[PDB]
């Protein structure tokens, strides 16, 4: 249980335990100061001018030095462990979403992953560290004060030890009331924020009907309501303290009277009552903060389970065993049907594509429907719903992704560039295999040395985000440089360059010339040249391979291609 | 200067004055509490009689009652002027948000509008509230503490009254340094947080190249840098308190020494010295809060200036004077040319579109470019760049917008529904002018009562959000029902539906057959029926009036609509 929570911080006994030993001292020094306040009253100022008046002036600075130094040491060497657990938990959490199926990035949570990891980890250990130092130095204070209080009186503190549970329960019940009251305000804020957001969405539809005034009326009645809820918040919250303060004050008054009812008093040295009173009122910062440490254990476990909901979600399927050395085969579709996880209308109906090795197929459907996603099936991102995407005589699900995704080369213009050197991008995830001697001529064969030399260093310019920002058309040229270096057997263009750029196009159409010399290639064609020089053009009218065939036999057969050739005449 | 802004808060003098005068007391309570300590020590346990201090417990309970009571009194009536100022500023800001040109809603800040009204106003209100409590409670604490220090001592108080401002200067100097250190750390956080985002941005480009192995290392580097930045934060943060309190303690040591160096002092009883030490070991909360309050004045003023900048933006133009009653006329365009603020390529070239009286013109467009914005000039959402949109012989710039937008009824698929009574939405912004006997006939006339009487409350039903979720196709039915009751002479059906409701959309078409027996209508078309009965068809191809005629005189002229009639045949 708690015994088995030990190994997660196994290499961190050193700093944490040093923090603990320098964190109990921070309470012991607080105790020693009041202990020294005891003699300064009676013996110090009774019948003497020194021996207290000379000790104390420098011993007080000594103890505050020993208090400041221990505060620094505790904070810093507890923050070291806090940060070195945040870093390792966040590192594992990130390493468990590079192996997450691509459905996870369906825009539902694409932007919220960074926020998730950073906020969750910055919250899980801030709460745990705060609770740890709020259960030791807020917990050593109590023991130290009670020791120093029993040593100075035998009975005056018995009433305090009997009384303290009253103060504790009062503080806890008042805080629990406040927390319980604070529950429904999430619902109230939702109710009012929804109205406010719905209110100014239809700006066009408010102007056009001439209803500005009857709109400010509704907003003034919403702002009135939301201000009333705010005042309810403050009135509920602000009376958390002034009642537990009254309770502890009743405690103090009971003690003060009890110190004088029977003849038991008069054994109180003139300064003993001073240090007893001071040690009692100083005991309000611990005793009050100690009850409300469960409020941080609960938050810590809440955040821990929150991340555990994610650190163990669904994992991209790996259930294959075979391997590839080279996919010199004819990729076969068959009766494949596929509908996005989270969608109802089938994106792809029956299919019979038979891309043969060494040749190309041009996916050109005007509807812009279904062609973009016959590139996310052959590479096993979103798996098929029914059918078999045969590759080199075998299925995809019989093949380990490690080499399947290494075969295909997903050329496009949207190829995200890593923030590293350009000649690191060209051989990315393979920097050891390719020596820059290869990379130079590889940039050549994909037409890249030309816009690379004009850079400041050479094939060396950090190029990614916050880098140099290569041109949209030069990003296609560098995507070819990558795909040409890798020497892939199956190529997947994407021709995202609907808006063509001249001159760059010459070197682009020239580069794509070398890439598609062999290397069977599913090209999502949109440019007259690729379609014209393709080998089996294939259209997809929003659900299905409608009209398929070679070009010159296809223009004669109108169907849907001629009517789509005219639109792009 | 400062006096000038008091009339802005003049109506709240009662609340703010009660706040001040019940705030002073909460400080006076502690001062008189320490004053109560002097008899308890000097006479209660100095003198033999036990009745000397039986006066204490009642008076300490009474003073803690009077501290809690004024705590609650001055928190609340400073959270009621905190509310009746944030409310009025939010309301005065949203009443200058429904008058900005539609271009201001160009999606650059659509979500922010609720925040601008709330988060910044909450910021200014909370900052000013907190600042006022801590320059008056603390300010009069200090005055009270030093008044009760003087009445009990002379030399100690004089030594303290000089060496404390040195602690104050120390407090600020340790702070200003912390702020200067923390200034650039926001930039550091931005720089470090950018990179994680980039890597999870291109997850596809990681899988498709087999490069998990060279992303674990990169996030290892980034996580190490982030952790080290956090540790630098903590290390620089935790030298504020353990240093200012060291300065304060050294000052206290000087107090004790130079308060007991000669025999001139030590006239102090055992009580006056405890009172001096008590007041000062107490004085640390005020002398620090009152000194760091300037961290809020400039911050609250910054938020206030943010609100005054967002308020002082550009009002929608209103440079018109004419008032129209019911304009039946040959509205026209002439050489219009128009580009959205924030873009380069114009959307509209020289246009001679001409809506005739009675007749209706239909807009059809293959690529969906340039149609919709002809409905955002005929109602003056965007002022035209070069041209003159005639309307009975005047530019639309010269009509009072509230009297021009009072002529155009904009039916649509995506009409807005205010969360109110159906009897309102069918007579929105005019429920005073129109009685329910008009709605009774109108909602029938658009064939929509069949969709209303089925509901729980009929025309009392809440129809928007938190309401009955009226179906999209029937929101168009309600848009007709509304535009019937207004019975405006210029109609702008968007007919961008594409969605089909069997027999129901047929009843919607029958309704439109009643909507446009009159009412010169510029209907942007995607349906066969509207074009078939259209009186003058005007087709735009992405920038300009390309072809324009009538269906029976067009389809023989092969043009561009006929070769689009084939595509939606």
């Amino acid at each position: 249980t708690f015994r088995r929570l030990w190994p997660t911080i196994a290499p961190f006994k050193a700093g944490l335990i040093v923090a603990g030993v320098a964190l109990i001292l921070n309470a012991a020094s607080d105790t020693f100061m009041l202990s020294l306040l005891k003699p300064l009253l009676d013996d110090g100022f009774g019948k003497t001018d020194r021996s207290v008046l000379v000790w104390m002036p420098l011993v007080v600075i000594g103890l505050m030095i020993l208090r400041g130094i221990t505060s620094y040491v505790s904070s810093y060497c507890i923050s070291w462990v806090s940060g070195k657990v945040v870093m390792t938990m966040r590192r594992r959490l990130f390493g468990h979403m590079m192996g997450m199926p691509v459905s996870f990035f369906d825009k539902q949570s694409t932007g919220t992953l960074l926020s998730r990891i950073t906020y969750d980890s910055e919250q899980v250990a801030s709460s745990s560290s705060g609770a740890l130092i709020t259960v030791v130095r807020e917990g050593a204070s109590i023991i130290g004060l009670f020791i120093m209080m029993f040593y100075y009186s035998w009975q005056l503190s018995i009433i305090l030890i009997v009384l303290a549970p009253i103060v504790s329960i009062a503080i806890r019940v008042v805080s629990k009331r406040f927390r319980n009251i604070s529950k429904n305000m999430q619902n109230t804020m939702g109710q009012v924020t929804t109205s406010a957001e719905q209110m100014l969405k239809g700006h066009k539809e408010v102007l056009i009907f001439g209803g500005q005034e009857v709109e400010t009326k509704r907003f003034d009645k919403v702002s009135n309501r939301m201000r009333l809820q705010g005042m309810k918040m403050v009135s509920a919250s602000s009376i958390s303290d002034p009642i537990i303060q009254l309770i502890a004050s009743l405690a103090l008054a009971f003690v003060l009277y009890a110190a004088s009812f029977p003849s038991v008093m008069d054994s109180l040295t003139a300064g003993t009552i001073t240090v007893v009173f001071s040690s009692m009122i100083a005991l309000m910062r611990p005793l009050k903060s100690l009850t409300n440490v469960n409020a941080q254990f609960q938050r810590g476990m809440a955040a821990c389970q929150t991340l555990f909901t994610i650190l163990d979600s669904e994992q991209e399927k790996d259930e294959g065993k075979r391997v590839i050395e080279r996919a010199t085969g004819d990729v076969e579709f068959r009766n494949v049907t596929f509908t996005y996880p989270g969608r109802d209308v089938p994106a792809l109906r029956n299919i019979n594509l038979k891309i043969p090795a060494g040749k190309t197929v041009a996916l050109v459907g005007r509807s812009g429907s279904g062609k973009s996603t016959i590139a996310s099936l052959i590479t096993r991102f979103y798996d098929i719903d029914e059918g078999e995407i045969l590759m080199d005589g075998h299925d995809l699900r019989e093949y380990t992704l490690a080499s399947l995704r290494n075969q295909v080369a997903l050329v496009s213009q949207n190829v995200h560039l890593f923030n590293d050197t350009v000649a690191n991008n060209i051989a990315y995830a393979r920097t050891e295999q390719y020596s820059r001697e290869q990379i130079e001529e590889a940039a050549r064969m994909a037409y890249a040395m030309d816009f690379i030399n004009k850079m400041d260093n050479g094939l060396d310019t950090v190029i990614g985000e916050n880098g140099v920002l290569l041109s949209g058309g030069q990003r296609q040229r560098i995507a070819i440089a990558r795909a040409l270096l890798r020497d892939s057997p199956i190529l997947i263009l994407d021709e995202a360059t609907s808006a063509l750029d001249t001159e760059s196009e010459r070197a682009i159409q020239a580069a794509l010339d070398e890439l598609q010399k062999n290397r069977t290639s599913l090209v999502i064609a949109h440019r007259l040249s690729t379609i014209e020089k393709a080998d089996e053009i294939v259209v997809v009218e929003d659900g299905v391979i409608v009209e398929r065939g070679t070009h010159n036999d296809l223009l004669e057969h109108r169907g849907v291609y001629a009517q789509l050739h005219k639109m792009q005449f | 200067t400062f006096r000038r802004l008091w009339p802005t808060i003049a109506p709240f003098k009662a609340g703010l004055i009660v706040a001040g005068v019940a705030l002073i007391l909460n400080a006076a309570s502690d001062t008189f509490m320490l004053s109560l300590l002097k008899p308890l020590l000097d006479d209660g346990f100095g003198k033999t009689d036990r009745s000397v201090l039986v006066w204490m417990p009642l008076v300490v309970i009474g003073l803690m009652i009077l501290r809690g009571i004024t705590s609650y009194v001055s928190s609340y009536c400073i959270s009621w002027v905190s509310g009746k100022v944030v409310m009025t500023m939010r309301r005065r800001l949203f009443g200058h948000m429904m008058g900005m040109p539609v271009s201001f809603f160009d999606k650059q800040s659509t979500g922010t509008l609720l925040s601008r009204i709330t988060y910044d106003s909450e910021q200014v209100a909370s900052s000013s509230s907190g600042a006022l409590i801590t320059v008056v409670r603390e300010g009069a604490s200090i005055i009270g503490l030093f008044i009760m220090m003087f009445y009990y001592s002379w030399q100690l108080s004089i030594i303290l009254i000089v060496l404390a401002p040195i602690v104050s200067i120390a407090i600020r100097v340790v702070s200003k340094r912390f702020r200067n250190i923390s200034k650039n750390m926001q930039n550091t956080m931005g720089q470090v947080t950018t990179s994680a985002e980039q890597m999870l941005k291109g997850h596809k480009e990681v899988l498709i190249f087999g490069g998990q192995e060279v992303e674990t290392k990169r996030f290892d580097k980034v996580s190490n840098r982030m952790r080290l930045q956090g540790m630098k934060m903590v290390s620089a943060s935790s030298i504020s308190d353990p240093i200012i309190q060291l300065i304060a303690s050294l000052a206290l040591a000087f107090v004790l020494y130079a308060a007991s160096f000669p025999s001139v002092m030590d006239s102090l009883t055992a009580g006056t010295i405890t009172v001096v030490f008590s007041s000062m070991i107490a004085l640390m909360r005020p002398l620090k809060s009152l000194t760091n309050v300037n961290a809020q004045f400039q911050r609250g003023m910054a938020a206030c200036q943010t609100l005054f900048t967002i308020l002082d933006s550009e009002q929608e133009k209103d440079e018109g004077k004419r008032v129209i009653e019911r304009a039946t006329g040959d509205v026209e365009f002439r050489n219009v040319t128009f580009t959205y603020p924030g873009r380069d390529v114009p959307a509209l070239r020289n246009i001679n579109l001409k809506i005739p009286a009675g007749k209706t013109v239909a807009l059809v467009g293959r690529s969906g470019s340039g149609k919709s914005t002809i409905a955002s000039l005929i109602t003056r959402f965007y002022d035209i760049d070069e041209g003159e949109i005639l309307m009975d012989g005047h530019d639309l710039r010269e009509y009072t917008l509230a009297s021009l937008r009072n002529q155009v009824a904009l039916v649509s698929q995506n009409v807005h529904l205010f969360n109110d009574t159906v009897a309102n939405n069918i007579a929105y912004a005019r429920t005073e002018q129109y009685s329910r006997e008009q709605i009774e006939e109108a909602a029938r006339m658009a064939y929509a009562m069949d969709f209303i009487n089925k509901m729980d409350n009929g025309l009392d039903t809440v129809i928007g959000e938190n309401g009955v979720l009226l179906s999209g196709g029937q929101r168009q039915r309600i848009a007709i029902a509304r535009a019937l009751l207004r019975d405006s002479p210029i109609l702008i059906l968007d007919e961008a539906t594409s969605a089909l409701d069997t027999e129901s959309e047929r009843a919607i078409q029958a309704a439109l057959d009643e909507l446009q027996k009159n009412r010169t209508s510029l209907v942007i078309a995607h349906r066969l029926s509207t074009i078939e009965k259209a009186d003058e068809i005007v087709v735009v191809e992405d920038g300009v009036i390309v072809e324009r005629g009538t269906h029976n005189d067009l389809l023989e002229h092969r043009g561009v609509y006929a070769q689009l009639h084939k595509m939606q045949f």
Epitope: G543, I545, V546, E547, R548, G549, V560, Q563 | -
Partner: nanobody, 113 residues
């Protein structure tokens, strides 16, 4: 497996009219292209009739106001109606689905007397 079956007539008079049918199975029949070629004893294939997703008609330059393509959405069946026959049109007519690299029925030759 998608397939098609074609039915047609035989020897008929010149200048007459006929209707030739073709039923398709294993098909998403409403959206695929559908077509009818003709193959002469000496000449190779060349499309004459074509019907489409939206149901549209196209023919050879010679075939204009001469042939009629139609389909029954429910029956999974298409038809070519031939009017004003000519002796030069004696050939073998081929049903076809889903483009020239699609599918090819048996085809039924028709002789013009």
């Amino acid at each position: 497996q998608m397939q098609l079956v074609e039915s047609g007539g035989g020897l008929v008079q010149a200048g007459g009219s006929l209707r030739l049918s073709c039923a398709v199975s294993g098909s998403i029949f409403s959206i695929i292209t559908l077509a009818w070629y003709r193959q002469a004893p000496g000449k190779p294939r060349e499309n004459v009739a074509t019907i489409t997703r939206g149901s549209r008609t196209s023919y050879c330059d010679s075939v204009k106001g001469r042939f009629t393509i139609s389909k029954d959405n429910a029956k999974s069946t298409v038809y070519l109606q031939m009017n004003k026959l000519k002796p030069e049109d004696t050939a073998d007519y081929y049903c076809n689905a889903e483009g020239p690299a699609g599918y090819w029925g048996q085809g039924t030759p028709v002789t013009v007397s």
